[PDB]
């Protein structure tokens, strides 16, 4: 019944957004809540954010 | 490289002593950079007669 | 209400430097240093490559025969190329090179306003005697982080399928740190200093930066001073 | 009747059919978003009875 078929391959690039699941190797799950600016990130005396 | 300015600032008086003012159009992180820099000087360095 | 002013600006490396502000009253070193760190790390002028049209490449997911870097990987390398302009808000740079060897950032075509701060910056390698790569590198200037995704809304026929877009990295600043040490001027009760240790790609000079930072600062206070 | 992969689609503008070649298939490498036509396809339905 099928005369012809067209298969299209799309490559989407997704980065990260609130709602994604994240975990370490130790069994700690997580769901990214907010994406915070570098300005509001806790930093050390040397000034490198976390 | 143009920079966004606020608008609307309805001032709600609470009696005669204190009040809650509001500023709508602040870009990313500027709410803290301002709010904190003003909180800093308000509580600390101000002219006063006690 | 004694006001501050700048003082010795010590360049150390082409990357980073320690600027200093001598006349700060009690606690004002913190009130600025944090308020200044904020605008420094975030809103600053920068020019990062945006649209790149390469030789035979239809999309960022292919591989050009004769170069060991995947096209996607070469685009990412461009996002890290540091340049500076003077009188143009967008300039399109033409990069050409061939022959076995590294293709660095000094192999581009120099322009009146082009200054490449890292001529050794590796764009990609070249693995074959005769293999040639031509690319139109469109660099513009702006503020903040504009990811390639949010760019495709205006669109309005960017049909050049060979024009591949990259993410806007615009910012000079890498790491900013402020330290307030007590500054003793010969006569005064107690005054403080401000040591701002910043880190940069070399595309902005320290004195220029700290001005436009503080510039925007007072510019936002404009409305504030009244209602 | 048989379904055609032809690029002639009732009720679509030039901007829609732009990203398609003469045959009706999106060009390789053309970046697309939600709603763009990847493959033109049309199936016979006769005597609509409006």
Swiss-Prot record, chain A:
Biotech and industrial use: Co-administration of salinamide and rifampicin or salinamide and myxopyronin suppresses the emergence of resistance to both antibiotics.
PTM comment: the record says: Acetylated on several lysine residues in the presence of glucose.
Task: From the record, give the cysteines joined by S-S bonds.
Answer: none
Briefly state the protein's biological role.
Answer: DNA-dependent RNA polymerase (RNAP) catalyzes the transcription of DNA into RNA using the four ribonucleoside triphosphates as substrates. Resistance to the antibiotics salinamide A, salinamide B, rifampicin, streptolydigin, CBR703, myxopyronin, and lipiarmycin can result from mutations in this protein.
Subunit structure of this entry? The RNAP catalytic core consists of 2 alpha, 1 beta, 1 beta' and 1 omega subunit. When a sigma factor is associated with the core the holoenzyme is formed, which can initiate transcription. The rRNA transcription and antitermination complex (rrnTAC) consists of RNAP, NusA, NusB, NusE (rpsJ), NusG, SubB, ribosomal protein S4, DNA and precursor rRNA; S4 is more flexible than other subunits. In pull-down experiments interacts with CedA.
Q: What family is this protein classified in?
A: Belongs to the RNA polymerase beta chain family.
For this entry, the protein name equals: DNA-directed RNA polymerase subunit beta
From Swiss-Prot, chain C:
Recorded catalytic reaction(s): these are:
RNA(n) + a ribonucleoside 5'-triphosphate = RNA(n+1) + diphosphate
Where are the residues of the annotated region Alpha N-terminal domain (alpha-NTD)?
1-227
Q: PTM comment for this protein?
A: (Microbial infection) ADP-ribosylated on both alpha subunits by the phage T4 protein ModA. ADP-ribosylated on only one of the alpha subunits by the phage T4 protein Alt.
Q: Which keywords describe this protein according to UniProt?
A: Acetylation, ADP-ribosylation, DNA-directed RNA polymerase, Nucleotidyltransferase, Transcription, Transferase
GO BP annotation list:
bacterial-type flagellum assembly; bacterial-type flagellum-dependent cell motility; cell motility; cellular response to cell envelope stress; DNA-templated transcription initiation; intracellular iron ion homeostasis; nitrate assimilation; regulation of DNA-templated transcription elongation
Q: Which GO terms describe its molecular function?
A: DNA binding; DNA-directed RNA polymerase activity; protein dimerization activity
Q: What is its EC number?
A: 2.7.7.6
Q: List the disulfide bonds.
A: none
Q: Where is this region: Required for interaction with Crp at class II promoters?
A: 155-158
Q: What are its GO cellular component terms?
A: cytoplasm; cytosol; cytosolic DNA-directed RNA polymerase complex; membrane; transcription elongation factor complex
**Domain of life, source organism:** Bacteria
Q: What do we know about how this protein assembles, alone or with others?
A: Homodimer. The RNAP catalytic core consists of 2 alpha, 1 beta, 1 beta' and 1 omega subunit. When a sigma factor is associated with the core the holoenzyme is formed, which can initiate transcription. Both the N- and C-terminus interact with different regions of transcriptional regulator CRP. The rRNA transcription and antitermination complex (rrnTAC) consists of RNAP, NusA, NusB, NusE (rpsJ), NusG, SubB, ribosomal protein S4, DNA and precursor rRNA; S4 is more flexible than other subunits.
Q: Which family does it belong to?
A: Belongs to the RNA polymerase alpha chain family.
Known function: DNA-dependent RNA polymerase (RNAP) catalyzes the transcription of DNA into RNA using the four ribonucleoside triphosphates as substrates. This subunit plays an important role in subunit assembly since its dimerization is the first step in the sequential assembly of subunits to form the holoenzyme.
Q: What is known of its domains?
A: The N-terminal domain is essential for RNAP assembly and basal transcription, whereas the C-terminal domain is involved in interaction with transcriptional regulators (such as CRP) and with upstream promoter elements.
Q: What is this protein called?
A: DNA-directed RNA polymerase subunit alpha
**Source organism of the structure:** Escherichia coli (strain K12)
The stretch of the full-length protein covered here is: 8 to 234 of 329
């Amino acid at each position: 019944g099928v005369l012809k078929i067209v298969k299209v391959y799309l490559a989407v690039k997704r980065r990260i957004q609130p709602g994604d699941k994240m975990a370490g190797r130790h069994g700690n799950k997580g769901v990214i809540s907010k994406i915070n600016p570098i300005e509001d990130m806790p930093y050390d005396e040397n000034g490198t954010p976390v | 490289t143009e920079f966004l300015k606020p608008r609307l600032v309805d001032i709600e008086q609470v009696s005669s002593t204190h009040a809650k003012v509001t500023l709508e159009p602040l870009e990313r992180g500027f709410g803290h950079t301002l709010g904190n820099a003003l909180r800093r000087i308000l509580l600390s360095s101000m002219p006063g007669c006690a | 209400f004694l006001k501050p002013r700048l003082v010795d600006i010590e360049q150390v490396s082409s990357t980073h430097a320690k600027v200093t502000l001598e006349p700060l009253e009690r606690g004002f070193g913190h009130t600025l240093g944090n308020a200044l760190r904020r605008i420094l790390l975030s809103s600053m002028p920068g020019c990062a490559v945006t649209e790149v049209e390469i030789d035979g490449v239809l999309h960022e997911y292919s591989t050009k025969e004769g170069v060991q870097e995947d096209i996607l990987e070469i685009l990412l390398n461009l996002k890290g190329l540091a340049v500076r302009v003077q009188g143009k808000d967008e300039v399109i740079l033409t990069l050409n090179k061939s022959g076995i060897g590294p293709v660095t950032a000094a192999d581009i075509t120099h322009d009146g306003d082009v200054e490449i701060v890292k001529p050794q910056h590796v764009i990609c390698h070249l693995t074959d005697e005769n293999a040639s790569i031509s690319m139109r590198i469109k660099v513009q200037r702006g503020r903040g982080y504009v990811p390639a995704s949010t760019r495709i809304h205006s669109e309005e026929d960017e049909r050049p399928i060979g024009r591949l877009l990259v993410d806007a990295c615009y910012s000079p600043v890498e790491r900013i740190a402020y330290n307030v040490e007590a500054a003793r001027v010969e006569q005064r009760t107690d005054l403080d200093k401000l040591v701002i240790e910043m880190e940069t790609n070399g595309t902005i000079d320290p004195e220029e930066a700290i001005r436009r930072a503080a510039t925007i600062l007072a510019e936002q206070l404009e409305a504030f001073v009244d209602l | 009747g048989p379904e055609e992969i032809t690029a002639d689609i009732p009720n679509v503008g030039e901007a829609a059919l732009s990203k398609l070649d003469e045959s009706g298939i999106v060009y390789i490498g053309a970046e697309v978003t939600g709603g763009d036509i990847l493959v033109g396809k049309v199936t016979p339905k006769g005597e609509t009875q409006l």
